[PDB]
Design an enzyme around this catalytic site. Structure first.
Site, PDB file in Angstrom:
ATOM      1  N   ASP A  35       1.592   3.278   2.912  1.00  0.00           N
ATOM      2  CA  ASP A  35       0.896   2.780   1.729  1.00  0.00           C
ATOM      3  C   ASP A  35      -0.442   3.470   1.442  1.00  0.00           C
ATOM      4  OD1 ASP A  35      -0.124   1.243  -0.354  1.00  0.00           O
ATOM      5  OD2 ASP A  35      -0.447  -0.534   0.884  1.00  0.00           O
ATOM      6  N   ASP A 220      -0.633   5.797  -5.570  1.00  0.00           N
ATOM      7  CA  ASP A 220      -0.375   4.693  -4.642  1.00  0.00           C
ATOM      8  C   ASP A 220       1.084   4.623  -4.230  1.00  0.00           C
ATOM      9  OD1 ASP A 220      -0.103   2.359  -3.236  1.00  0.00           O
ATOM     10  OD2 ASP A 220      -0.480   1.030  -4.942  1.00  0.00           O
TER      11      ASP A 220
HETATM   12  C1  LIG Z   1       0.122  -2.306  -4.827  1.00  0.00           C
HETATM   13  N1  LIG Z   1      -0.176  -2.750  -3.462  1.00  0.00           N
HETATM   14  C2  LIG Z   1      -0.423  -4.058  -3.203  1.00  0.00           C
HETATM   15  O1  LIG Z   1      -0.285  -4.940  -4.037  1.00  0.00           O
HETATM   16  C3  LIG Z   1      -0.879  -4.445  -1.815  1.00  0.00           C
HETATM   17  C4  LIG Z   1      -0.076  -3.638  -0.807  1.00  0.00           C
HETATM   18  C5  LIG Z   1      -0.612  -3.838   0.596  1.00  0.00           C
HETATM   19  C6  LIG Z   1       1.381  -4.037  -0.746  1.00  0.00           C
HETATM   20  C7  LIG Z   1       1.752  -5.278  -0.235  1.00  0.00           C
HETATM   21  C8  LIG Z   1       3.109  -5.632  -0.168  1.00  0.00           C
HETATM   22  C9  LIG Z   1       4.114  -4.764  -0.597  1.00  0.00           C
HETATM   23  C10 LIG Z   1       3.739  -3.533  -1.119  1.00  0.00           C
HETATM   24  N2  LIG Z   1       4.663  -2.592  -1.560  1.00  0.00           N
HETATM   25  C11 LIG Z   1       6.003  -2.616  -1.488  1.00  0.00           C
HETATM   26  O2  LIG Z   1       6.645  -3.555  -1.054  1.00  0.00           O
HETATM   27  C12 LIG Z   1       6.724  -1.410  -2.031  1.00  0.00           C
HETATM   28  C13 LIG Z   1       8.104  -1.459  -2.264  1.00  0.00           C
HETATM   29  C14 LIG Z   1       8.741  -0.335  -2.799  1.00  0.00           C
HETATM   30  C15 LIG Z   1       7.981   0.812  -3.065  1.00  0.00           C
HETATM   31  O3  LIG Z   1       8.561   1.934  -3.568  1.00  0.00           O
HETATM   32  C16 LIG Z   1       9.777   1.900  -4.301  1.00  0.00           C
HETATM   33  C17 LIG Z   1      10.239   3.334  -4.550  1.00  0.00           C
HETATM   34  F1  LIG Z   1      10.130   4.037  -3.433  1.00  0.00           F
HETATM   35  F2  LIG Z   1       9.477   3.867  -5.466  1.00  0.00           F
HETATM   36  F3  LIG Z   1      11.477   3.340  -5.015  1.00  0.00           F
HETATM   37  C18 LIG Z   1       6.611   0.828  -2.810  1.00  0.00           C
HETATM   38  N3  LIG Z   1       6.012  -0.267  -2.295  1.00  0.00           N
HETATM   39  C19 LIG Z   1       2.396  -3.161  -1.174  1.00  0.00           C
HETATM   40  N4  LIG Z   1      -0.189  -2.254  -1.211  1.00  0.00           N
HETATM   41  C20 LIG Z   1      -0.211  -1.878  -2.416  1.00  0.00           C
HETATM   42  N5  LIG Z   1      -0.267  -0.646  -2.610  1.00  0.00           N
END
Ligand SMILES: CN1C(=O)C[C@@](C)(c2cccc(NC(=O)c3ccc(OCC(F)(F)F)cn3)c2)N=C1N
Length: 365
Positions: A35, A220
């Site tokens: 992340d 991000d």
């Molecule tokens: C946006 N964001 C937040 O709201 C806080 C935090 C820690 C967070 C918290 C919980 C989950 C997530 N992110 C995800 O679950 C996630 C799921 C799929 C993702 O990518 C999908 C794909 F790869 F593009 F297809 C990216 N992130 C991020 N990090 C972030 N970057």
């Protein structure tokens, strides 16, 4: 050893790219979301019905409590964990132990979701976002110090339309093609960069460049879609709709999918970024292949959504490139990626330079 940092990320069909980690002594194996939008290393510390595994500190002889817990809140989801430190190994990459801060989650809400395969998060942004405060050293900062590696990481995500690579401590030539273009980091919290112009099917949006940095524009990996501030989102929707001419209102808000390829019916979308020389820019372009997303003939989601406060270049856009987070030189790099292909078809483009005479000297309000 950059070539053993290749294919160290799994993408589980769009639910986040995650890295395997061995934590503590003797090692417990976790799956950790990579992340670039946060700054804590946090992992499950108790059972939760939506995860397979968690990190049990009592089973680690090298774990040391730090004697405070920390509560983190997001727009959606929140959690409380104990702060402590322990040894960590990344088998695919760093098979040498380094000691890092770690938050073990014992209470949370809408954070561990059904079907998700990660059970912790690796926050790779700057200390200023660290909780409870910037003095909780970040994972990457610990690695840089203890391993004497350069202060750079990079990321190939190969799941456009199955995983990719996180390169800690540098850049891997086989992961990109052609020139690298760099844009300055404007503020060291998020990876905030300066967006100068959006272009739809070759025509630029009619908006002050400050709208694009309305609060912040950031890269991000922990965000799925390309996210755009409401004003900018609404203008983009009009420009896409008009430039294709096929739509129900619900397609643009993500409440309906369209079933049919359609890609030839939609336009390219270009993001202009300021170059390290301020008098030029370069652009990253996504083709309909990245933002008109097959979900299963096929049915499609609009891969762009509104944000209250930030323009977020999320994981779906990053799947179009090799992305370099050059902390040492305060810049983010973008290069064409060999694996950014759907059945051999390109999903993205990068080009430059272009003059920046038509645009304000500072687009960040
Ligand atoms: C946006 N964001 C937040 O709201 C806080 C935090 C820690 C967070 C918290 C919980 C989950 C997530 N992110 C995800 O679950 C996630 C799921 C799929 C993702 O990518 C999908 C794909 F790869 F593009 F297809 C990216 N992130 C991020 N990090 C972030 N970057």
């Amino acid at each position: 050893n950059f070539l053993a940092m290749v294919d160290n990320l799994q993408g589980d069909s769009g639910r986040g790219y995650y890295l395997e980690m061995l934590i503590g002594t003797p090692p417990q194996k976790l799956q950790i979301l990579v992340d670039t939008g946060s700054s804590n290393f946090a992992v499950a510390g108790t059972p939760h019905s939506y995860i397979d595994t968690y990190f049990d500190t009592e089973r680690s002889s090298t774990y040391r409590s730090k004697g405070f817990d920390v509560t983190v809140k997001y727009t959606q989801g929140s959690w409380t964990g104990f702060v402590g430190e322990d040894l960590v190994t990344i088998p695919k990459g760093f098979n040498t132990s380094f000691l890092v801060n770690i938050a073990t989650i014992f209470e949370s809400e809408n954070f561990f979701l059904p079907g998700i395969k990660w059970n912790g998060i690796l926050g790779l942004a700057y200390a200023t976002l660290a909780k409870p405060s910037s003095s909780l050293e970040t994972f990457f900062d610990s690695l840089v110090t203890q391993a004497n590696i350069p202060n750079v990481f990079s990321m190939q995500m190969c799941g456009a339309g199955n995983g990719g690579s996180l390169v800690l401590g540098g850049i891997e030539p086989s992961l990109y093609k052609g020139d690298i273009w760099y844009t300055p980091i404007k503020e060291e919290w998020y990876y905030q960069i300066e967006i100068l112009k959006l272009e739809i099917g070759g025509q630029s949006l009619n908006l002050d460049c400050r709208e694009y940095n309305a609060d912040k524009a950031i890269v991000d990996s922990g965000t799925t879609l390309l996210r755009l501030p409401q004003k900018v989102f609404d203008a983009v929707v009009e420009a896409v709709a008009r430039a294709s001419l096929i739509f129900s209102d619900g397609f643009w808000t993500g409440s309906q999918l369209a079933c049919w390829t359609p890609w030839s019916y939609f336009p390219k979308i270009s993001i202009y970024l300021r170059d390290e020389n301020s008098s030029r820019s370069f652009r990253i372009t996504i083709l309909p292949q990245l933002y008109i997303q097959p979900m299963m003939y096929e049915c499609y989601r609009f891969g762009i959504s509104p944000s209250t406060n930030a323009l977020v270049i999320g994981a779906t856009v990053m799947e179009g490139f090799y992305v370099i987070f050059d902390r040492a030189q305060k810049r983010v790099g973008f290069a064409a990626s060999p694996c950014a292909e759907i059945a051999g078809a390109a999903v993205s483009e990068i080009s430059g330079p272009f003059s920046t005479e038509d645009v304000a000297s500072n687009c960040v309000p």
